Amino acid sequence: AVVGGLGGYMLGSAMSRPIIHFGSDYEDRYYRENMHRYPNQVYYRPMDEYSNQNNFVHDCVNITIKQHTVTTTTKGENFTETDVKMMERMVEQMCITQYERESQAYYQRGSS
């Protein structure tokens, strides 16, 4: 359970291990630590329209970022543009990784 409320948004079931890998050790390393304070789940809007894949993917990102800033602002915000981009990268990856996970989950067990 994750208490949030919000104005009618749907919560993701979190990820087993949200990891970032650019190939540049800076990003990889920086995210490994900051994940402790970053979320493990994202927030998406229960839209009615059909839209396109990118719409829903990016929607989860925009909401999570936009709500997360208001969160820290209430706490006397203190973050860099890099922090926001890191938390943005991960939440963007949530949708993309789940896209991957939806595909792999199609196969029963692992051995046919």
Side-chain angles (χ1 to χ4, degrees):
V2 180
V3 183
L6 298 174
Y9 300 86
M10 299 276 72
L11 177 65
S13 310
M15 191 174 301
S16 46
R17 51 182 177 211
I19 311 296
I20 294 295
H21 184 256
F22 275 83
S24 308
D25 211 66
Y26 175 90
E27 290 87 316
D28 300 354
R29 175 62 180 148
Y30 190 73
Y31 177 75
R32 292 306 304 229
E33 298 291 89
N34 280 271
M35 66 168 57
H36 286 227
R37 304 173 184 182
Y38 293 165
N40 188 27
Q41 51 279 143
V42 290
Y43 316 85
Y44 42 96
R45 306 167 65 230
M47 62 183 64
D48 177 272
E49 41 272 86
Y50 191 81
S51 302
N52 203 329
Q53 301 181 330
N54 293 89
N55 298 32
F56 184 78
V57 171
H58 218 53
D59 186 87
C60 311
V61 183
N62 175 80
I63 292 301
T64 307
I65 293 294
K66 208 58 173 294
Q67 296 302 270
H68 204 227
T69 47
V70 182
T71 305
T72 181
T73 296
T74 309
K75 295 177 189 298
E77 67 189 277
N78 183 262
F79 56 89
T80 60
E81 298 294 290
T82 306
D83 294 291
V84 193
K85 288 180 181 179
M86 291 300 175
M87 70 182 68
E88 192 188 271
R89 218 304 179 229
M90 57 173 295
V91 299
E92 193 95 67
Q93 273 296 147
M94 297 276 193
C95 314
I96 301 176
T97 305
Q98 192 59 32
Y99 183 103
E100 289 291 291
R101 296 184 177 275
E102 295 301 290
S103 303
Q104 61 179 90
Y106 188 63
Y107 290 99
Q108 304 173 330
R109 298 183 297 253
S111 310
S112 304

PDB file of all heavy atoms in Angstrom, residues 3 11 75 86 91 97 101-102:
ATOM      1  N   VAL A   3       0.119   5.334   0.446  1.00  0.00           N
ATOM      2  CA  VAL A   3      -0.829   6.409   0.698  1.00  0.00           C
ATOM      3  C   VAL A   3      -0.425   7.671  -0.056  1.00  0.00           C
ATOM      4  O   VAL A   3       0.678   8.190   0.125  1.00  0.00           O
ATOM      5  CB  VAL A   3      -0.937   6.731   2.203  1.00  0.00           C
ATOM      6  CG1 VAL A   3      -1.994   7.797   2.446  1.00  0.00           C
ATOM      7  CG2 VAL A   3      -1.246   5.481   3.010  1.00  0.00           C
ATOM      8  N   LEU A  11      -2.082   4.365  -9.415  1.00  0.00           N
ATOM      9  CA  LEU A  11      -0.725   4.083  -8.974  1.00  0.00           C
ATOM     10  C   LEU A  11      -0.200   2.795  -9.598  1.00  0.00           C
ATOM     11  O   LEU A  11      -0.942   1.820  -9.762  1.00  0.00           O
ATOM     12  CB  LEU A  11      -0.691   3.986  -7.446  1.00  0.00           C
ATOM     13  CG  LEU A  11       0.663   3.620  -6.841  1.00  0.00           C
ATOM     14  CD1 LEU A  11       1.681   4.713  -7.112  1.00  0.00           C
ATOM     15  CD2 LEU A  11       0.525   3.374  -5.348  1.00  0.00           C
ATOM     16  N   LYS A  75       8.477  21.084   1.437  1.00  0.00           N
ATOM     17  CA  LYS A  75       9.492  20.697   2.407  1.00  0.00           C
ATOM     18  C   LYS A  75      10.690  21.631   2.366  1.00  0.00           C
ATOM     19  O   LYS A  75      11.737  21.342   2.949  1.00  0.00           O
ATOM     20  CB  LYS A  75       9.951  19.273   2.117  1.00  0.00           C
ATOM     21  CG  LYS A  75       8.867  18.224   2.314  1.00  0.00           C
ATOM     22  CD  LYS A  75       9.355  16.836   1.931  1.00  0.00           C
ATOM     23  CE  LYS A  75       8.216  15.824   1.905  1.00  0.00           C
ATOM     24  NZ  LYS A  75       7.575  15.646   3.236  1.00  0.00           N
ATOM     25  N   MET A  86      17.065  12.766 -13.425  1.00  0.00           N
ATOM     26  CA  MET A  86      17.280  11.393 -12.988  1.00  0.00           C
ATOM     27  C   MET A  86      15.957  10.744 -12.616  1.00  0.00           C
ATOM     28  O   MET A  86      15.650   9.634 -13.057  1.00  0.00           O
ATOM     29  CB  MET A  86      18.244  11.337 -11.802  1.00  0.00           C
ATOM     30  CG  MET A  86      19.667  11.713 -12.167  1.00  0.00           C
ATOM     31  SD  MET A  86      20.372  10.621 -13.418  1.00  0.00           S
ATOM     32  CE  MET A  86      21.940  11.430 -13.719  1.00  0.00           C
ATOM     33  N   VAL A  91      11.318   7.229 -14.231  1.00  0.00           N
ATOM     34  CA  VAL A  91       9.875   7.086 -14.375  1.00  0.00           C
ATOM     35  C   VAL A  91       9.484   6.916 -15.842  1.00  0.00           C
ATOM     36  O   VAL A  91       8.507   6.234 -16.150  1.00  0.00           O
ATOM     37  CB  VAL A  91       9.097   8.257 -13.732  1.00  0.00           C
ATOM     38  CG1 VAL A  91       9.387   8.333 -12.241  1.00  0.00           C
ATOM     39  CG2 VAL A  91       9.425   9.574 -14.402  1.00  0.00           C
ATOM     40  N   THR A  97      10.109  -0.084 -19.571  1.00  0.00           N
ATOM     41  CA  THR A  97      10.519  -1.368 -19.022  1.00  0.00           C
ATOM     42  C   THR A  97       9.318  -2.293 -18.861  1.00  0.00           C
ATOM     43  O   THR A  97       9.419  -3.493 -19.097  1.00  0.00           O
ATOM     44  CB  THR A  97      11.219  -1.181 -17.659  1.00  0.00           C
ATOM     45  OG1 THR A  97      12.310  -0.263 -17.794  1.00  0.00           O
ATOM     46  CG2 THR A  97      11.726  -2.501 -17.111  1.00  0.00           C
ATOM     47  N   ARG A 101       8.394  -5.869 -20.154  1.00  0.00           N
ATOM     48  CA  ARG A 101       7.918  -6.914 -19.252  1.00  0.00           C
ATOM     49  C   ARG A 101       6.606  -7.532 -19.734  1.00  0.00           C
ATOM     50  O   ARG A 101       6.363  -8.721 -19.529  1.00  0.00           O
ATOM     51  CB  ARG A 101       7.764  -6.363 -17.832  1.00  0.00           C
ATOM     52  CG  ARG A 101       9.085  -5.920 -17.224  1.00  0.00           C
ATOM     53  CD  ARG A 101       8.933  -5.465 -15.783  1.00  0.00           C
ATOM     54  NE  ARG A 101      10.227  -5.116 -15.197  1.00  0.00           N
ATOM     55  CZ  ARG A 101      11.054  -6.005 -14.643  1.00  0.00           C
ATOM     56  NH1 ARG A 101      10.685  -7.274 -14.520  1.00  0.00           N
ATOM     57  NH2 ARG A 101      12.245  -5.628 -14.191  1.00  0.00           N
ATOM     58  N   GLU A 102       5.760  -6.731 -20.371  1.00  0.00           N
ATOM     59  CA  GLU A 102       4.519  -7.235 -20.955  1.00  0.00           C
ATOM     60  C   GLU A 102       4.822  -8.222 -22.080  1.00  0.00           C
ATOM     61  O   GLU A 102       4.088  -9.189 -22.287  1.00  0.00           O
ATOM     62  CB  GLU A 102       3.667  -6.085 -21.497  1.00  0.00           C
ATOM     63  CG  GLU A 102       3.157  -5.135 -20.425  1.00  0.00           C
ATOM     64  CD  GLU A 102       2.304  -5.829 -19.388  1.00  0.00           C
ATOM     65  OE1 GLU A 102       1.173  -6.238 -19.722  1.00  0.00           O
ATOM     66  OE2 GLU A 102       2.749  -5.958 -18.229  1.00  0.00           O
TER      67      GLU A 102
END
